[PDB]
């Protein structure tokens, strides 16, 4: 079932100056997760920790929430809900919280919440916003991507982007940012290779 709508990917820093950051990981073959600034592309491994930093100029109020949603990057695929492939949908990798069809999970956060949208059919995962730790400049969320860019019949090898939106306690929009994601076997090599065509 395609969705009747397409979620916004328009950058919106908002009142609190919401930006995304990523570790400066490099492209050694041992990296499990590395971000390309030039491509604004996260290269990460299936089910491996994928840290994403939230940077604000000023603290969002209490009750603020942080949501992640995947969509397809290409226009003809945009209305199709991004979901796990049949193989991963059925596999025995449940962490007890996430729905078996959800591409994106959050690890190490017992307040993680997952949504099947009643009306748009989109999957998303929301956690509460927490300020950075003492002496830290950003908030780090630890995502996991539970299908591969080479899975059969899921993403079926189509490119996707993640949308990170900041919301107040009622779900209203406070900020939005986005990045492309390639979930693959050797993120370091893939980033170096894709970066070589520039």
């Amino acid at each position: 079932p395609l969705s009747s709508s397409v979620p916004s990917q328009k950058t919106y820093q908002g009142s609190y100056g919401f930006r995304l950051g990523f570790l400066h990981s490099g492209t050694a073959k041992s990296v499990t997760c590395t971000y390309s600034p030039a491509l604004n592309k996260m290269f990460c491994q299936l089910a491996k920790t994928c840290p994403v930093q939230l940077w604000v100029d000023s603290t969002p109020p209490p009750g603020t929430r942080v949501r992640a949603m995947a969509i397809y990057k290409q226009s003809q695929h945009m209305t199709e809900v991004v979901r796990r492939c049949p193989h991963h949908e059925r596999c025995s990798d449940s962490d007890g919280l996430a729905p078996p069809q959800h591409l994106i999970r959050v690890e190490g956060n017992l307040r993680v919440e997952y949504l099947d949208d009643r009306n748009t059919f989109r999957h998303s995962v929301v956690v509460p916003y927490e300020p950075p730790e003492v002496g830290s400049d950003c908030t780090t969320i630890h995502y996991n991507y539970m299908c591969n860019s080479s899975c059969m019949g899921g993403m079926n090898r189509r490119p996707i982007l993640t949308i990170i939106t900041l919301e107040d306690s009622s779900g209203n929009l406070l900020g939005r940012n986005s990045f492309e994601v390639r979930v693959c076997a050797c993120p370091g090599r893939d980033r170096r290779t894709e970066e070589e065509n520039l």
Binding site: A47, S94, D95, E107, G108
Partner: protein, 123 residues
């Protein structure tokens, strides 16, 4: 030559550093779960490997799933391990100290998906 360890409902072991006395021939972990969450959401185990093997044991363990105590079956990288326990459960494990080296880096960890970063320590 024994040690008592707990995992609470906050994805925490109550220690992050085990030492085994060189004298011991066998060593025993006594794992318990004083929390209230069942093991499909807060299942802990105490799994021992080399530091170099920890991440592989964790990834293959996660994908093995709840019904395999989140462990890859027959994993050679696992020196010893309890079973997965949830609230109110306890399990012990005993392994020969001859499986350890004095010039080697060992880690202990839970393999519950997404809890390993938080539940680890040196042996």
């Amino acid at each position: 030559c024994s040690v008592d360890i707990q995992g609470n409902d906050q994805m925490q072991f109550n220690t992050n550093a085990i030492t085994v006395d060189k004298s011991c021939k066998q060593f025993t972990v006594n794992l318990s779960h004083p929390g209230n969450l069942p093991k499909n959401v807060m299942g802990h185990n105490w799994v021992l490997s080399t530091a170099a093997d920890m991440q592989g044991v964790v990834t293959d363990g996660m994908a093995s799933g709840l019904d395999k105590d989140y462990l890859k079956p027959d994993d050679s990288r696992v020196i010893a391990h309890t079973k997965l326990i949830g609230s109110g459960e306890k399990d012990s494990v005993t392994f020969d100290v001859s499986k350890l080296k004095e010039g080697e880096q060992y880690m202990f960890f839970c393999t519950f998906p997404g809890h390993s970063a938080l539940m680890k320590g040196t042996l």
